[PDB]
Amino acid sequence: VPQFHRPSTVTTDSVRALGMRGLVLATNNSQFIMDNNHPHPQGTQGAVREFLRGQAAALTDLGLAHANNTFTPQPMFAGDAPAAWLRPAFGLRRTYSPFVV
């Protein structure tokens, strides 16, 4: 479990194991005073790189919580189709409302 006033604590698996609903509330309940006794080993800029790796890993975890509610997304452009020498390739402009009752 990470503590966001300590830069050398943020990892991917600390962010990803925390839920997206929990990720927001953890950062909003942290401490104002930043500790400088132990920095991140890749620098403070490396911790920002480390932090965004956990969000995109949790949004894909968030999308799998809605797999019983959305559809299988079709490809968007031409040129990506298995049977191409007899029928050509379309692509759905994703303008509809994917929702499953």
Partner: protein
Amino acid sequence: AFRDARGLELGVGRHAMAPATIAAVRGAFDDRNYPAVFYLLQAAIHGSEHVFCALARLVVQCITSYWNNTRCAAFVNDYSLVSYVVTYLGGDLPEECMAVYRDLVAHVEALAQLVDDFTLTGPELGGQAQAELNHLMRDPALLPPLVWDCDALMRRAALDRHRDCRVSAGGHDPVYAAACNVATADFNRNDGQLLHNTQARAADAADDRPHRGADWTVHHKIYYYVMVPAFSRGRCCTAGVRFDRVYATLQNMVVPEIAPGEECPSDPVTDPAHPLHPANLVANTVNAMFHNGRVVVDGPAMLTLQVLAHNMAERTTALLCSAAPDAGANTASTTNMRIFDGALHAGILLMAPQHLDHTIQNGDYFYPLPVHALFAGADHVANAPNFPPALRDLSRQVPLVPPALGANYFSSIRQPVVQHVRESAAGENALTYALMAGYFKI
């Protein structure tokens, strides 16, 4: 009083932008609550085909929400974002909404044919097209001021060596990468490295060739140097964009779970299952950001933001370049000089001065950069932090372009094109021809 009468020479029935589509553009350069979400999306969609064809449900419901709050056009400063809506978003915007977006596109291709009426049929001269060596907007010697690509950069280096075509992108020669991902972030690298992310699909990924047509850069150079200064009257400028926080403040996602027997919410007032309801407005979140601009967004359209996990972007870099004069002008008394044009790879032009907000600090996202003398805001530059107080009366008269982005005399467009914009009264239809009447070479 003379250029405006010369500007009426091309207004003899080529194209007229309708007055109902003028004021829908002027307002977008005047909104002090233009919602700052759209500035994040211009840093998010960032010129790409694949990102735009997933975020269609957002961008329609961002425009149609903005259509019912101010009645102005959206995404105006990016011709790449104008042209993608006019190609893709056909039957989801209303009938009345599409009328503005064509008169910002079909006007531009009428501006491109101004070249094609005053140029004779000639052969190539210095390995270059004959239509280039008359009018400035056809030359690849220039660059568009906001380039999400290397499309103008690929075609420039293919010129002959008699015109010195080098680009010093921050002291280093430009190296062209392929793509950017989660594990290739490196947000502060200092190589001469630029992106080529904007592609039709993933498999069509090349760096030995440019990805788009050759007229495409001419459509931008017309849009950013003629259309944009004709509206803003010299009250706009470019800016460099901190990508560190934009990918953060778009992925502060709070998405409520939908019950498996219920239905999709569509009400930002009544129901609590909606991501703009106050029981889901957690501070410093993405749902807080859409409520800031009163942008009505549907529920599962928020889930489509995951495309930003695949197509990242590095940073904004400065772009200086040298250029020898024309092939039909290279006298030996002229070989000893150059012409330096400024550009920003992956930048965003600001429209209205939002320095009077106190809900977002100044040095958060958009550090301003006055690239060209046409783009130098009187309130934009003089409200960035650490501005010295002995210049606030100096900042008002003169523009404030640094010579790290090209000065007056070593650029292409000098000072007085700026002052012709402010001191004219021709209207928004005659200036876009009268400016074109000034970009002809000598």
